[PDB]
Amino acid sequence: EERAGRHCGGLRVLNSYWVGEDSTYKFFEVILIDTFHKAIRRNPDTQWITKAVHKHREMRGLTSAGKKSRGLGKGHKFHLTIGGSRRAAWKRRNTLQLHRYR
Amino acid sequence: VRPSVEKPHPCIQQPRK
Amino acid sequence: ASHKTFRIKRFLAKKQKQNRPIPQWIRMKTGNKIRYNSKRRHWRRTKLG
Amino acid sequence: TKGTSSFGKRRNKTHTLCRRCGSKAYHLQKSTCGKCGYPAKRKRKYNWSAKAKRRSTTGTGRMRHMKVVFRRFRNGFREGTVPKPR
Amino acid sequence: IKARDLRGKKKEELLKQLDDLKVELSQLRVAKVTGGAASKLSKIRVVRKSIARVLTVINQTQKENLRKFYKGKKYKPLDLRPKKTRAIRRQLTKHEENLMTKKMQRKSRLYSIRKFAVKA
Amino acid sequence: KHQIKHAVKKLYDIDVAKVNTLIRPDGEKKAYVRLAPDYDALDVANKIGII
RNA sequence: CACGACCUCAGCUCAGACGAGAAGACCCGCUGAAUUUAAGCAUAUUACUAAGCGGAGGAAAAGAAACCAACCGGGAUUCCCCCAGUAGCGGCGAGCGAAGAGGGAAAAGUCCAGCGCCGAAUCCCCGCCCCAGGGCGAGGGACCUGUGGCGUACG
RNA sequence: CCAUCUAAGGCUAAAUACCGGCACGAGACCGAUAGCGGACAAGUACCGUGAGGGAAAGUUGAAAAGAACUUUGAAGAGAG
RNA sequence: CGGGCGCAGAUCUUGGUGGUAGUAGCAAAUAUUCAAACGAGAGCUUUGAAGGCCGAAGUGGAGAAGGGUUCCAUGUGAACAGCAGUUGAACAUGGGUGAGCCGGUCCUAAGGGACGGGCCUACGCCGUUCGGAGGGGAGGGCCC
RNA sequence: UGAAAAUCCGGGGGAGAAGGUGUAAAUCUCGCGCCGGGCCGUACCCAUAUCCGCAGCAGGUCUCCAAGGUGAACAGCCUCU
RNA sequence: AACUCUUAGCGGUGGAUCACUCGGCUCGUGCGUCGAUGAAGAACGCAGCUAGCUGCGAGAACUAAUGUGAAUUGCAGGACACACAUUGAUCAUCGACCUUUCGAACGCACAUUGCGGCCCCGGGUCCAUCCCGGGGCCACGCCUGUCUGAGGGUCGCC
Ligand SMILES: [Mg+2]
Ligand SMILES: [Mg+2]
Ligand SMILES: [Mg+2]
Ligand SMILES: [Mg+2]
Ligand SMILES: [Mg+2]
Ligand SMILES: [Mg+2]
Ligand SMILES: [Mg+2]
Ligand SMILES: [Mg+2]
Ligand SMILES: [Mg+2]
Ligand SMILES: [Mg+2]
Ligand SMILES: [Mg+2]
Ligand SMILES: [Mg+2]
Ligand SMILES: [Mg+2]
Ligand SMILES: [Mg+2]
Ligand SMILES: [Mg+2]
Ligand SMILES: [Mg+2]
Ligand SMILES: [Mg+2]
Ligand SMILES: [Mg+2]
Ligand SMILES: [Mg+2]
Ligand SMILES: [Mg+2]
Ligand SMILES: [Mg+2]
Ligand SMILES: [Mg+2]
Ligand SMILES: [Mg+2]
Ligand SMILES: [Mg+2]
Ligand SMILES: [Mg+2]
Ligand SMILES: [Mg+2]
Ligand SMILES: [Mg+2]
Ligand SMILES: [Mg+2]
Ligand SMILES: [Mg+2]
Ligand SMILES: [Mg+2]
Ligand SMILES: [Mg+2]
Ligand SMILES: [Mg+2]
Ligand SMILES: [Mg+2]
Ligand SMILES: [Zn+2]
DSSP states (O other), X not given: OHHHHHHOTXXXXXXXXXXXXXXXXXXXXXXXXXXXXXXXXXXXXXXXXXXXXXXXXXXXXXXXXXXXXGOOOSSXXXXXXXXXXXXXXXXXXXXXXXXXXX | OOOSSOXXXXXXXXXXX | OOSOOHHHHHHHHHHHHHXXXXXXXXXXXXXXXXXXXXXXXXXXXXXXX | OOSTTTGGGOOOXXXXXXXXXXXXXXXXXXXXXXXXXXXXXXXXXXXXXXXXXXXXSTTSSOOTTXXXXXXXXXXXXXXXXXXXXX | OOTTTTTTSOHHHHHHHHHHHHHHHHHHHHHHXXXXXXXXXXXXXXXXXXXXXXXXXXXXXXXXXXXHHSTTOSSOOGGGSOOSOTTGGGSOOHHHHSOOOHHHHHHHHHSOOOOOOOOO | OXXXXXXXXXXXXXXXXXXXXXXXXXXXXXXXXXXXXXXXXXXXXXXXXXX
């Protein structure tokens, strides 16, 4: 999905799924959305993807296929990423909180 | 203008007997 | 050399017009604060590449 | 030799003026500038040189069409109307 | 060569006044090389700014006519469109952001937060 | 050479035989317009204010 | 393609749009060292750091539980204090090291697919009529390989 | 046996961060070998093929009133 | 009450100044000489004469690369030209490079490098006459 | 075994075009006439003082032209421009 | 006599010290906006006399508009400026207008102001060919739709 969303810069990746397997290759199908088509901008249930914050969402770990690798969740399994990303948690746990009256 | 200092640009000396 | 490109010749023209001495009336205007052009280059001492 | 007798054979330009950064770094044989990365579409910058980034960052030049955005922002990008005449 | 006086004139006389100011500026460049005088070279900046206000009225008049011409047209030239910034031009218009689907129209009709107050 | 020849035929209404352009060392292009034999460059230079 | 429909795949300086680069303090996804420490050093440490690559926003990311707890039970996420230099990891050496509860800042919750009833009730384009908001056209399409309405774990 | 949630689809403000940018207020700080490399025509002059390296340099007086004029010297430079 | 709080040293940092010191030195490729002019000023500029060297693989006449106004005329003698200067490649004020037939432009050589495709998590890289439905000129009145 | 390409030409080929009794088609100017040729470089030094080596540095830097006498000589020595 | 050393006065060399500060540094607050509608950066050019810096783009040291209400300044000087009353000097603000070339840079390329094509307009040509000048265009990837197609790929009807 990162390889498809980069070749088609004018479209935003929605999701992807598995369609074929082999010993050498894996075949997928990526679903892209043209966020400037009127059939998509005039639908209130699809205007969320037309926002500027979703620019290249598949190469920031926001699609379902790429969000899994970030290792986030709720529970004793996912203490590493408490605070969003694993780097946000690592930064918080290493900042020396020098208070004003310590 | 010139730098303050510049890089400057052989006896073996072993007595035996 | 004698074989120049237009971009090189246009570059040498600007450096030739920048090498002019400071006007005399500029000195009296600034009260001898700017007496000499601090970017005067000589063709033997400074090369422009 | 390797010194004074070898500096006399220097009469062949290696770099020339680039078309994107105006610096004498455009390699002739490699056809690639050594300061801005021309003709690659992305300008080369590196975080291991804070001084090299400070000389060519945004704001060290003129900002012709960007200093106007700063002036139009303080009024809300107002366009299409005219002040009240006398 | 007055700002407000060049607007009542028409295109034929503005251009006629424009070229008559250029033939006067050309005669000042001739005197500038021939030696000129004090009262003669000091008018170069006056004529330069005169052809600027004459040419300004010509430019901002033809654009007002083009804006009246493309008024109501669905497709306008790119220079006649609002140039706010590249991010604003790609945002949802007032019509597209006010679109409220038939589900949250009913939800916003009978489940809207009311105005209440607590005694103590 | 065609624009310079056509410009002087309009600014002063004088025919030109040939034009020799030359970019001076300071970046300014200098032209040598040779007028037709029916016109005299001494009379034209006095009308346009050269002399 | 004798004459059509369709599927699949092409061409254009075809009508209208979109992507590129910059910046990068903060933010997101990868990649990734060694100086240094262990008085040597190889695991460890330095460090899931510097440098390298990609992608954004005024915030980003996270987020409405396949949670914590084992209690008379708590109830999205983020942040601060505390838990705590604690449980634990480690040539168990040097060193590393969270979390539940609790006290605070702020608090807002929800939409599809599926299930299947509603004569596709849906959408874009084009040509228009009225005062950003509503209609028309025996126009051209999209779509039954599924648009829209009701509806989502609280039934 | 009991407790708990319903995974492999989507959205969501506020508390949070901000050595970049625009515009401001302040200081038990530095006072021209200090404080930013840069109080000045400073990332300038200058060096290197290049990546890059990178300075020195503030102060007449309240007001130029910046020394008319005479005199010696070719003139700088002196004497009134 | 708060510190960027006390210097003789660190082949300390930066700036300045001494002894050495009117010292070393201005010694590679044969040479200068008389008169005159200009001038405040002449071994050194200019003119004339005399005597010499480079001796046509030149100390001659023209270019390429490179330099970029150093080219030319006039003026000045502060600084610079390691003595001097009436001189200069210095300083100041003006001026100067004219093309259908000189060269660039045009051609491909080595080689560089797009396109198709493949590869790389990626910025991108591999590859170069092979590989894609890669043919947008020519003709007959619609054919090819 | 000691280059490619632009470009130019000749031949083979006889598809086609030309007029019906004086011309026509066609002419590799075939004798001459008419119009046009844009853009860029162009000064100077090219080396015991205009390049590089911190400099007017005994170094380094690709070529063309090249006289008389002695002599085998573009050697050395002398002379003219 | 000289010369050398010491002390003090004065004068040189040198620049310390002190005083000054339109600079820096640090903290806090409000905003938090670039770009194919051509950005950042770069090149060249622009003032009567202008090298640099700053400001601008062939309308080039700024034009229009509005607020302000008599200057700019080195010497000039001259203002469609001033007795604003022929509605305005300057400054500030900045809703109009303008913004050369390179640059993601976009006809192909660039150590080249090199080499092209299409459409339209004016002139030379007036026998529409050719030449010159002007303007609008021609990159890559991708989306929706139109148009023109291709393959016994799957069929229908003959
Ligand atoms: Mg030199
Ligand atoms: Mg629904
Ligand atoms: Mg980007
Ligand atoms: Mg160790
Ligand atoms: Mg040790
Ligand atoms: Mg990094
Ligand atoms: Mg916030
Ligand atoms: Mg978000
Ligand atoms: Mg909880
Ligand atoms: Mg404790
Ligand atoms: Mg660790
Ligand atoms: Mg989200
Ligand atoms: Mg900040
Ligand atoms: Mg300082
Ligand atoms: Mg600073
Ligand atoms: Mg003062
Ligand atoms: Mg100290
Ligand atoms: Mg000391
Ligand atoms: Mg000697
Ligand atoms: Mg010899
Ligand atoms: Mg000159
Ligand atoms: Mg000379
Ligand atoms: Mg002279
Ligand atoms: Mg001397
Ligand atoms: Mg001279
Ligand atoms: Mg000079
Ligand atoms: Mg034949
Ligand atoms: Mg010559
Ligand atoms: Mg010499
Ligand atoms: Mg004694
Ligand atoms: Mg003493
Ligand atoms: Mg003293
Ligand atoms: Mg542009
Ligand atoms: Zn460059």
